[PDB]
Amino acid sequence: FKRYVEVGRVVLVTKGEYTGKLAVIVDIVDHKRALIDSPCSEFPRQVIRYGSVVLTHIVMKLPRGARSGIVAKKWKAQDVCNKWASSAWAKKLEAKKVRSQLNDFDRFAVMRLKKQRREQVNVAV
Amino acid sequence: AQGHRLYVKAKHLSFQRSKHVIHPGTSIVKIEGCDSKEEAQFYLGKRVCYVYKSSKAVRGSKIRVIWGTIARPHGNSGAVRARFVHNLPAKTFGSSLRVMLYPSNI
Amino acid sequence: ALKEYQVVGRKVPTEHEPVPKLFRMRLFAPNESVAKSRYWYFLKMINKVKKATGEIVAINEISEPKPLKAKVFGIWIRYDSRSGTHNMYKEFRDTTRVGAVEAMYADMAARHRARFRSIRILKVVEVEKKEDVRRNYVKQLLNPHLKFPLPHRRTKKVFAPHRPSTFY
Amino acid sequence: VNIIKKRTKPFKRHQSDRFKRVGESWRKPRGIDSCVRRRFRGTISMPKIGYGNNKKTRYCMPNGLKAFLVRNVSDVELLLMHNKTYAAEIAGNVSARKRVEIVEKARALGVKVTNAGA
Amino acid sequence: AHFVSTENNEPVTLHP
Amino acid sequence: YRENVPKKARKAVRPTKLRASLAPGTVCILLAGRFRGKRVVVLSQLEDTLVVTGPYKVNGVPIRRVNHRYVIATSAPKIDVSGVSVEKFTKAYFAKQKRSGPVKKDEAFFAENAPKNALPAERIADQKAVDAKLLPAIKAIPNMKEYLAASFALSNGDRPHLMKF
Amino acid sequence: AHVQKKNPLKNKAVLSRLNPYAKAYKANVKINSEKTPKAAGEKFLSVLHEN
Amino acid sequence: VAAAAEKKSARQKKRELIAKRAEAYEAEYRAAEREQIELARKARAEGNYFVPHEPKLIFVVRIRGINNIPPKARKIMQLLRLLQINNGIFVKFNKAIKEMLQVVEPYVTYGIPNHKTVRELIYKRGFGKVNKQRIPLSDNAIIEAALGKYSILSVEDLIHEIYTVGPNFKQAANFLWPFKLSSPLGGWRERKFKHFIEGGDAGKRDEHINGLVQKML
Amino acid sequence: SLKKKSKRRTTRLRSRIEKKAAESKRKQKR
RNA sequence: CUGCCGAAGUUUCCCUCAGGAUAGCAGAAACUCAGAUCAGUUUUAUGAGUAUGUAAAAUGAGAGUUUCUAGUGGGCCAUUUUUGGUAAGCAGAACUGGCGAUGCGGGAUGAACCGAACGUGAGGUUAAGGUGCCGGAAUGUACGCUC
């Protein structure tokens, strides 16, 4: 496959109040729950299920049951962020988030530029 | 010609009812694009509208309109309750209604 | 959800017993009153002390000392079966003692169609030595290189336009 | 103060429409097994004191005026002090000459006439 | 209310 | 006779508390009236309404009263209003004339008033004065004159409860 | 007298009628501080973390 | 100028008297709550166990209708003034009352309220029985007329007389009409007519009755 | 149906099943 | 025509008979005490061998009467006891409620099952039971069993 429930795999939370955040699996409690943690301050170390996460393609080495400090240090050292964002998957998500925050005037700014973009229609004869 | 539609499309589903009783006092409106009660709080209080066409022409205008107001969310799936000045006829289950963006609060 | 309570109780002081002994047991109840009620039922059935003659001296909710350390619990229970007499012992792995008890209760209601009424929890024990773990499923969980595909991924907006990926 | 009617439809007698011998006027169902007497769901309703209208708006025309039957000029002349409460009603058997005489008198008193178009 | 001795008779664990 | 004297009602009048985002100098969409869908700049904060106009040289929406319940206060960049006076707009300034009876009609009543006859020249003097004092601000920031000239309208898949106007 | 019943909980004028004390009631009071004296008996911890 | 002047001044001095009384009662509640906390903390520290206090005040709510009830139980309902579903009454928790309650155990729910629910009830749903009539407590003068013999002169004095179980607890019931409560917002539990311990809603429930009232009220 | 019989027990069976269960319990009590 | 009050099925015995009685109920008129004057209730004490009674604390209520006078004097259902009992049901009593006079919500539908005791409406909230569609309401969340 391509997605394995590994100690040290980083997962993207898709449910709960931490939706959209990026955490890393530190431990496997059982078949339906895993312990995850993230260096981001807002996100606390906790036990989350598997319906509330999606597996990413990044696997980073990390010893079983590492504490919050060690996980953050390994995350910083191996450059997990800016590796996740390097993927076109993350870029699509960030594009969606910023496009959600556009107001009416920015929508008209989007209006005008992409109409300029459209009218190029230059193709070889 | 797409510089119009200052309303939001919706549908009339039924009256507020139990299985063997109906109360035509309030009508159940499915506001298209609304998929929960926390979202239905936005349209809570807006001006809903049922537009139809008749045979006789009053005002030289072929369109009659029955005004109404969104009153309360009804359930989990984002349906609302509406109170029209004239209770909608039972032939208008599934008929399309309009949801004006006013009285505005955004 | 369940919560773990320690309840300490004794009978009323009197000339017969001026200083009755304190009797403390840890028992799992969703609320305060259920814990006291279960305490009186347990003490009556075991020691034969009447509800009227007694009174609660201390009730305290106990939180999990390490709610983030993956632990393995062994639970001995006395199931009230069709004959009213049956014993069990089940293993669980989770982070909170209440979680193991809650998972055990759902396990009982499933594999034996039991109630909260028929279950009597003898002892919940933390087991730390790997070789002291008995059950097969939990033991195979304890291996160091655990990895498996996301089991049962399963994943209003009716009428989606494209066929779901339903895979990686 | 707006006039309010709790009910507008009259209480028709049970089965007054399937028979020409049973009349429209209300009669109380006496039968012990009558599904109408036991007031089952969906059955027609029965007159009750609960439908009584407000004492302040009872006996009032849709314009808030009480009807007073008038047969000669003397009757309307007695209505001068209640031009705000009572509207005159010309009796059916009043002659044409008296009708125009009464209606002109009532106009002079400024008292409402419901059927002045006769 | 009152006070309840515990030192003299420390609470003892009870199991079903 | 009776003429029941109404009891002394204990209801008073207090200033209307407008929304937080309905400040003077903002840009808002117009939801009702003959100019529904237009975007207009709010000049002054009236008792109940908003004295609002689109720059008449831009879109052609004269200075009008609009009730605040038919206004969507967009987060578009604010346009300064300190440069224009706004005290001359009062409720009586906008009010209708009398009627002299309950019914008046006919196309002769339509060939009169119109935006020439019953329209005073002083109103254009005020209207041109406003445009003189706002066009420099609208010209300063980009797309703004073009933004106000355009019209707001919904599209398929556009859900207003999620759109941050 | 008393055509309509008004709640003191919602109508503040009716509290002033009922309580000539809600004028100064001062609900929230600093009775803790930086100085919290954590106090749980040592053997109480022993009996709590027992069995 | 006179006559009404002395009435206003006496009216005024009565206003400070209930103000001074109310201050005294509030200090009494806070001091009682404080010593509860301190004697719990001290006992838990030095080691010996503190014990709860046998309560003398409970709130009772009838949760079943008027149909299909044994004659023994409906008789108790009459003696308790619980003649309608979703009603509510206070009862001085004692051996006679406690032993009385188990008779109607599946038909009522009871527990020990604290000061807030007492204060909310009287203020909002407090209807006084004046001259055999359900007269609301919209004024302090209404309570003064019916309890001036027992030195209760305002709503707050009544609240203390109730919440702290004074001697005039019996001398305040027939002044006060049963609390005709609404159906609880959010609903009851899924199976309302089981015992509260068994996942139902009938019976003694203690610290989890305050919740119920907030909904019912 | 799909079966050789009807799963909906006619109200006679809904009537006499419970009473015959009651007679069974009385028999154990005796 | 509307409104108001509103039982009874078994009692009190009596009978030749059907019945009455007699109550009970519903009432109708006259007159005490602001009472321990009551209670289809609990509690305490007390004797006798949780219950028993008497007496007294709790609790709610204004509590008594003498007088005359309508209608009813069935049965069904279920619970608890319960002796004779047999393949097996079955029979016997005593008690309890519900039903007769009772509509409404639910159980697809129903004399008794589950809730709920009804003036005319508005709004809000629930009971029982439900939330795939018919059908108002989550093709909800979590853990298992079952092909």
mmCIF file of all heavy atoms in Angstrom, chain B residues 8 12 16 61:
data_model
loop_
_atom_site.group_PDB
_atom_site.id
_atom_site.type_symbol
_atom_site.label_atom_id
_atom_site.label_comp_id
_atom_site.label_asym_id
_atom_site.label_seq_id
_atom_site.Cartn_x
_atom_site.Cartn_y
_atom_site.Cartn_z
ATOM 1 N N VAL B 8 -32.320 32.867 -2.586
ATOM 2 C CA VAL B 8 -31.743 31.539 -2.423
ATOM 3 C C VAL B 8 -32.837 30.510 -2.661
ATOM 4 O O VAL B 8 -33.907 30.584 -2.047
ATOM 5 C CB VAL B 8 -31.118 31.364 -1.029
ATOM 6 C CG1 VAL B 8 -30.745 29.920 -0.790
ATOM 7 C CG2 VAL B 8 -29.912 32.258 -0.891
ATOM 8 N N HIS B 12 -40.564 23.459 -0.703
ATOM 9 C CA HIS B 12 -41.557 23.153 0.317
ATOM 10 C C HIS B 12 -41.700 21.641 0.410
ATOM 11 O O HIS B 12 -41.974 20.977 -0.593
ATOM 12 C CB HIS B 12 -42.895 23.804 -0.018
ATOM 13 C CG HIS B 12 -43.932 23.633 1.044
ATOM 14 N ND1 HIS B 12 -45.260 23.935 0.841
ATOM 15 C CD2 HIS B 12 -43.840 23.191 2.319
ATOM 16 C CE1 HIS B 12 -45.941 23.688 1.945
ATOM 17 N NE2 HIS B 12 -45.102 23.233 2.857
ATOM 18 N N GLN B 16 -45.841 21.031 9.048
ATOM 19 C CA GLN B 16 -45.394 20.497 10.323
ATOM 20 C C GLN B 16 -46.451 19.528 10.827
ATOM 21 O O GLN B 16 -47.631 19.877 10.922
ATOM 22 C CB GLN B 16 -45.149 21.627 11.316
ATOM 23 C CG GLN B 16 -44.676 21.188 12.676
ATOM 24 C CD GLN B 16 -45.727 21.360 13.742
ATOM 25 O OE1 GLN B 16 -46.512 22.304 13.707
ATOM 26 N NE2 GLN B 16 -45.746 20.451 14.706
ATOM 27 N N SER B 61 -50.510 41.844 -14.383
ATOM 28 C CA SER B 61 -49.311 41.120 -13.987
ATOM 29 C C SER B 61 -49.714 39.683 -13.725
ATOM 30 O O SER B 61 -50.645 39.429 -12.953
ATOM 31 C CB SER B 61 -48.673 41.743 -12.744
ATOM 32 O OG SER B 61 -48.606 43.153 -12.864
#
